[PDB]
Design a protein around this ligand. Structure first.
Ligand code: HEM
Ligand SMILES: c1ccc(-c2c[nH]cn2)cc1
Length: 391
């Protein structure tokens, strides 16, 4: 019998002591409430994610279908997955990327311009929440007329994607969010169909696989997948980045003095406070990790934050240090690994660096006003608020 549960209230408050207990004493940990095994060690998480044939993404189909309306990218495999992942990458690289970043600079500067005279800003609620959804819509090609309603509908769909055992009233609200978003987006996919632009929806629209376009509802599903994914972790990461730097003045100074260190500071923030905390997989056949037996059909959930703090992977893993280099250092698992590694990983780092540079440039002598954050979410996780002041 076990007494340390992922679903104790203490875990969401502060999961770090759970990571340390689980890695040492129960590295493949069963939770009866969701009939799943939680996997906490870097080596086991890496092996599971690298072996797409033994640990497959069928678990995601059950948690994605009701709100995304058709198959998402992580559910695909083989040539379909490879080619469609490439199409998605295309919208955020090359000339698509060069066109997009000035627009995201405009989004950044318009937010700053709204708060600059107030001499404080909430990096979570004033900047990240607003910027993340506008950014996703700019990437997709959706005009910002309705970013108010899009934000609301994104939030309900995210709640569904990132929760366990929701109550019937909650599922209802999340499905009405998903319907409203579909009711909004479907006509635009059809307008883009005969008036093609240079955005991600147009890429999906002109995608062809053996002279066979993908259905409109498949395009909707992929677009919904990108909208949700490009929005949710990016805003948490930005707030974590400035909180961690401000909580370590010496490292904030090194960043200020040498802006090239911002990328390393972003990477270390993703390692330290992994915003996507869980990755589920289904076990395809009998299998054993450590001495825990798994059966075909079992669910394993990789614990990204725990893996990224594994002392087998990193020296002093529970310390934030932007100067980590190279066991005492490994590649973090913040973006996963293997077949389903985050298509938006490079774009994420570029987005966050350009936003970080503008905040440092325009807000002078930043000081922390939220001296102690509170964090929420066990699937995705971030501060509820993170206020700074400036000159
Ligand atoms: C800090 C920001 C981000 C983090 C921490 C993050 C994290 C992750 C992780 C851990 C995975 C692996 C999921 C799995 O293996 O099942 C993933 C996959 C994915 N991410 Fe992100 N992501 C970020 C930003 C983005 C952005 C900006 C996009 C824009 C499209 C995006 C889209 C995707 C997609 C489509 C997948 C599925 C890719 C595939 O199945 O091959 N992500 N992400
Ligand atoms: C749940 C699972 C994965 C994500 C995700 C992947 N890439 C960006 N965001 C968001 C919510």
């Amino acid at each position: 019998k076990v007494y340390n549960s992922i679903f104790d209230q203490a875990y969401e408050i502060d999961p770090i002591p759970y990571f340390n207990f689980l890695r040492k004493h129960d590295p493949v940990h069963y939770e009866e409430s969701i009939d799943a095994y939680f996997v906490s060690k870097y080596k086991d998480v890496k092996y599971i994610l690298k072996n797409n044939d033994i640990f497959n993404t069928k678990t995601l189909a059950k948690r994605a279908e009701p709100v995304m309306k058709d198959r998402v990218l992580a559910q695909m495999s083989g040539q379909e997955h490879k080619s469609k992942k490439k199409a998605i990458l295309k919208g955020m690289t090359g000339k698509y990327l060069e066109n997009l970043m000035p627009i995201l600079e405009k989004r950044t500067n318009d937010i700053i311009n709204k708060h600059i005279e107030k001499k404080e800003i909430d990096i979570v609620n004033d900047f990240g929440k607003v910027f993340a959804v506008q950014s996703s819509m700019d990437l997709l090609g959706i005009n910002l007329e309705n970013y108010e309603k899009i934000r609301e509908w994104h939030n309900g769909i995210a709640k569904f994607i990132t929760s366990f055992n929701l109550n019937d009233e909650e599922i209802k609200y999340s499905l009405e969010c998903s319907d409203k978003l579909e009711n909004y987006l479907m006509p635009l996919i059809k307008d883009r169909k005969k008036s093609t632009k240079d955005d991600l929806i147009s890429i999906l629209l002109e995608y062809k696989n053996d002279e066979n376009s993908i259905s409109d509802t498949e395009i909707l599903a992929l677009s919904l997948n990108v909208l949700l994914a490009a929005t949710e972790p990016v805003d948490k990461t930005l707030a974590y980045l400035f909180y961690n730097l401000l909580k370590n003045p010496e490292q904030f100074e090194s960043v200020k003095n040498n802006p090239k260190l911002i990328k390393n500071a972003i990477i270390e923030t993703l390692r330290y406070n992994s915003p996507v905390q869980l990755i589920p997989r289904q076990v395809s056949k009998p299998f054993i990790f450590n001495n825990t037996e798994l059966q075909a059909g079992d669910t394993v959930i990789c614990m990204i934050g725990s893996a990224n703090r594994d002392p087998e992977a990193y020296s002093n893993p529970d310390e934030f240090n932007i100067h980590r280099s190279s066991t005492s250092h490994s590649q973090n698992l913040s973006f996963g690994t293997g077949v389903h590694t985050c298509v938006g990983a490079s774009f994420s780092l570029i987005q966050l660096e350009m936003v970080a540079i503008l905040l440092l440039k325009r807000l002078k002598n930043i000081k922390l006003k939220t001296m102690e954050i509170t964090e929420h979410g066990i699937y995705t996780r971030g501060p509820k608020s993170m206020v700074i002041s400036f000159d």
